[PDB]
Amino acid sequence: DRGTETVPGLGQRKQQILNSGGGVWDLAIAMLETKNLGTDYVYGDGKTYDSANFGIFKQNWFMLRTSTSQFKGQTTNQWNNGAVLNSNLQQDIKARQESQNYYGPDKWFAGHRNGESGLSNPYTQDITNYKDAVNWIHDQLASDPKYLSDDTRFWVDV
């Protein structure tokens, strides 16, 4: 299942993300993680330690602490450090980009979804379904420049 919906104010947030170092690809990922391109879901998305999620992409702390310049070398026990990404969009965006440039896109998808255990085999069907959804959303945003500044959300039910 997939479709469109109108979210008042989403256009301004899209532009803020592109103005903060995000690309269209980052927008597609974020668009699929929350409806408001926000960080105001429950803290850690209700998870802790290596599983905790932070920022507009819901990056997990395992990924943050292994593949970003901002968190490289920090421990599982230090997972609460990731919460600064809930209020620094520029750092949030730069972290995800560095994480993806460290692992490459295929492994990034796998670690983003399944953590440490996903890095073993990036190509299971579960990871593929997520990858496919992000790609469908990117294709829609890239089909008309007005989707980069209007209130249209493209959603996929993964």
> Of 9 and 23, which CB lies nearer to a copy of itself in the complex structure?
23
Beta carbon of residue 132, minimum distance to a copy of itself (angstroms, whole number): 10
Beta carbon of residue 68, minimum distance to a copy of itself (angstroms, whole number): 11
User: How far from 67 is each of 42, 99, 143, CA to CA, in Å?
Assistant: 24, 5, 32
Beta carbon of residue 100, minimum distance to a copy of itself (angstroms, whole number): 7
Residue 51 neighbours by CB under 8 Å, 6+ apart:
44, 60, 61, 62, 115
CA distance 86 to 144: 29
Beta carbon of residue 103, minimum distance to a copy of itself (angstroms, whole number): 7
104: left (phi over 0), alpha (psi -120 to 50) or beta: left
> Of 70 and 80, which CB lies nearer to a copy of itself in the complex structure?
70
For β-strands 2-6 and 152-156, DSSP reports them as antiparallel
Which residues contribute to the site for a copy of itself (CB under 8 A)?
22-26, 28, 97-98, 100-107, 134-135, 138, 142
> Of 76 and 101, which CB lies nearer to a copy of itself in the complex structure?
101
Residue 139 neighbours by CB under 8 Å, 6+ apart:
none
